[PDB]
Structure 1
Amino acid sequence: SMQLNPESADLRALAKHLYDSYIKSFPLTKAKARAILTGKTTDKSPFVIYDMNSLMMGEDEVAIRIFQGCQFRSVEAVQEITEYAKSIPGFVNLDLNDQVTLLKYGVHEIIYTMLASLMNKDGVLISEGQGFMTREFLKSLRKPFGDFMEPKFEFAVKFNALELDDSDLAIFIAVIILSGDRPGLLNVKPIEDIQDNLLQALELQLKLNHPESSQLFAKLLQKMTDLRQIVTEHVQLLQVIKKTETDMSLHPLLQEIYKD
């Protein structure tokens, strides 16, 4: 279109609203993370866990302790996403079973999207920017726990190459949540209508925000495929440890989601 009219103004207002919700819902944004990660004289300096010795210092089997850290964080992450979901124009207006469904099947895609914010070539920022854990350390975890994040790193470096900002991600995450094709949705049409509008919002945001890159919209939409594969892969990984590791157990609120 390339026209500043009433429809385009609404799409900006929607972009602004989602951004503001995202800032309120999500405490460590991408902008902060990038700043910390690039040594942009952010308030304090995270402790770098690169081995067993460095981990014991910072922690002021490990494979189990770290795995249980990632489930605890995963739980809070769902709070954050629940709160953001509820800020999306038309969302609370939907059947409760649909709302609950969209989140059942959304939260992991969103989790692995946001985790990319915390990652570079070297590793991931942990506990709101106070720690950094290396990729090679996480790989070196006792099998099969060395296998979990490697694929998220592989996703992230591809994803981070798109160079999206918090304003981009805000709309993107909304688009993901309102996915018409989740199992056992009563009313598809109303969800698809919100997503069509979110997709208009995104296409506009990207055009305005990314002069120097085309088929960014498309390359971004393709990422939703990579996200599905990552979640699928992640589940077949959770499946295996439940057999092998018949000595531990996994937070029940996650178990509700992890059987469908």
Structure 2
Amino acid sequence: SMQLNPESADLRALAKHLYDSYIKSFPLTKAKARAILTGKTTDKSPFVIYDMNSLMMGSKEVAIRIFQGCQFRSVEAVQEITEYAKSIPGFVNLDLNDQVTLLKYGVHEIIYTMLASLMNKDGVLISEGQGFMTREFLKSLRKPFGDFMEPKFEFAVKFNALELDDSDLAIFIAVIILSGDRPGLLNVKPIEDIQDNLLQALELQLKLNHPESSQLFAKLLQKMTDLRQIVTEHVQLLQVIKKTESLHPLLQEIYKD
């Protein structure tokens, strides 16, 4: 950051480009989510599902309904991330094998990342900001389902304290996709080379955007750990779901290894 030259200029262009794709690919940005959550917008005023009463107006049939709702958004979210991926310079030049691989293992990490954008301490925005379902209501569902989201909220409150904006996340999300340690990758090097350039862009983005924020870069890289864990901890919950009590086949496909 100390030096404004052709390399730093190239890193800003990669950041602008990724931001512009983020906007085209992700309708409900963090900036808009925050507006709704804090009241500012008159765009729409969401309905608050806070008990069984509220849910109907909007037994274990409700657990079915809500799990169903997640699956629908979860498939909607995987299309959003697929569209974004295509816009990351170099991504579409790798063996189809790797592309699909980088996405098989990434989507859920990006989902739990961007889910934080939709969350505060009280609950989560749903249906593109039309509804807001409370943490405590989601907690109250019949076992085992009332632990489904809690870890996603746990992650969110720590993540949202980083105070990242859509510019920040654009690059960060791209860094996650271009991970060179995904099982069964063929050409690791061209992914690492792309990620190294993305990590450069992020570092410079975070210095410009967060003047009085210490080791934010390191603190953001560490969150990739938390994310892997949410996925693993989630899979454990699903695995139970199957044995205890089906899944949309696109989610079924991604859950192979």
TM range (shorter): over 0.9
Contact 2:104 2:254 in 1 (8 A): yes
Contact 2:125 2:132 in 1 (8 A): yes
**RMSD value, Cα:** 1.6
Between the aligned partners of 2:32 and 2:254, the Cα distance in structure 1 is 31
Shift, 1:253, TM fit = 1.1
Contact 1:18 1:87 in 2 (8 A): yes
Between the aligned partners of 1:256 and 1:47, the Cα distance in structure 2 is 33
- My pick for the range that moved more, 50-59 or 150-159, is 50-59
Aligned-partner SS, 2:8: helix
Shift, 1:52, TM fit = 0.2
Give the structure-1-normalised TM-score: 0.97
* Residue 251 (structure 1) aligns with: 248
Contact 1:77 1:111 in 2 (8 A): yes
Contact 1:123 1:135 in 2 (8 A): yes
The structure carrying a bigger helix percent of its residues is 2
> Measured at CA, do residues 239 and 87 of structure 1 come closer, stay the same or move farther in structure 2, by a change above 3 Å?
same
Contact 2:85 2:91 in 1 (8 A): yes
Shift, 1:259, TM fit = 2.1
Aligned-residue sequence identity (percent) comes to 99
Contact 1:174 1:198 in 2 (8 A): yes
> Measured at CA, do residues 60 and 86 of structure 1 come closer, stay the same or move farther in structure 2, by a change above 3 Å?
farther
Between the aligned partners of 1:180 and 1:186, the Cα distance in structure 2 is 10
Q: Which runs of 4+ in 1 moved over 4 A?
A: none
Contact 2:155 2:226 in 1 (8 A): yes
Q: Give unmatched runs, 5+ long, in structure 1.
A: none
Between the aligned partners of 2:98 and 2:34, the Cα distance in structure 1 is 35
Between the aligned partners of 1:144 and 1:60, the Cα distance in structure 2 is 11
Contact 2:60 2:142 in 1 (8 A): no
Shift, 1:42, TM fit = 3.2
Between the aligned partners of 2:124 and 2:188, the Cα distance in structure 1 is 36
Shift, 1:60, TM fit = 19
Contact 1:18 1:170 in 2 (8 A): yes
Aligned-partner SS, 2:163: coil
Aligned-partner SS, 2:93: coil
Contact 1:104 1:257 in 2 (8 A): yes
Contact 1:168 1:206 in 2 (8 A): yes
Shift, 1:58, TM fit = 1.1
> Measured at CA, do residues 96 and 59 of structure 1 come closer, stay the same or move farther in structure 2, by a change above 3 Å?
farther
Between the aligned partners of 1:201 and 1:13, the Cα distance in structure 2 is 9
Between the aligned partners of 1:233 and 1:93, the Cα distance in structure 2 is 33
Between the aligned partners of 1:2 and 1:89, the Cα distance in structure 2 is 25
Report the count of equivalent residues: 257
Contact 1:86 1:92 in 2 (8 A): yes
Contact 2:88 2:174 in 1 (8 A): yes
Shift, 1:130, TM fit = 0.6
Residue deviations 1:129-177 (CA, integer Å, cap 9, x gap): 1100000000001111111110000000000000000000000000000
Contact 1:35 1:42 in 2 (8 A): no
Contact 2:116 2:153 in 1 (8 A): yes
Shift, 1:212, TM fit = 1.1
Between the aligned partners of 1:144 and 1:151, the Cα distance in structure 2 is 13
Shift, 1:41, TM fit = 3.1
Contact 1:46 1:131 in 2 (8 A): yes
Contact 1:178 1:194 in 2 (8 A): yes
> Measured at CA, do residues 7 and 45 of structure 1 come closer, stay the same or move farther in structure 2, by a change above 3 Å?
same
Contact 1:36 1:129 in 2 (8 A): yes
Contact 2:45 2:130 in 1 (8 A): yes
Residue deviations 1:8-55 (CA, integer Å, cap 9, x gap): 000000000000000000000000000000011331210000000011
Give the structure-2-normalised TM-score: 0.98
> Measured at CA, do residues 106 and 13 of structure 1 come closer, stay the same or move farther in structure 2, by a change above 3 Å?
same
Q: Give unmatched runs, 5+ long, in structure 2.
A: none
Between the aligned partners of 2:109 and 2:154, the Cα distance in structure 1 is 15
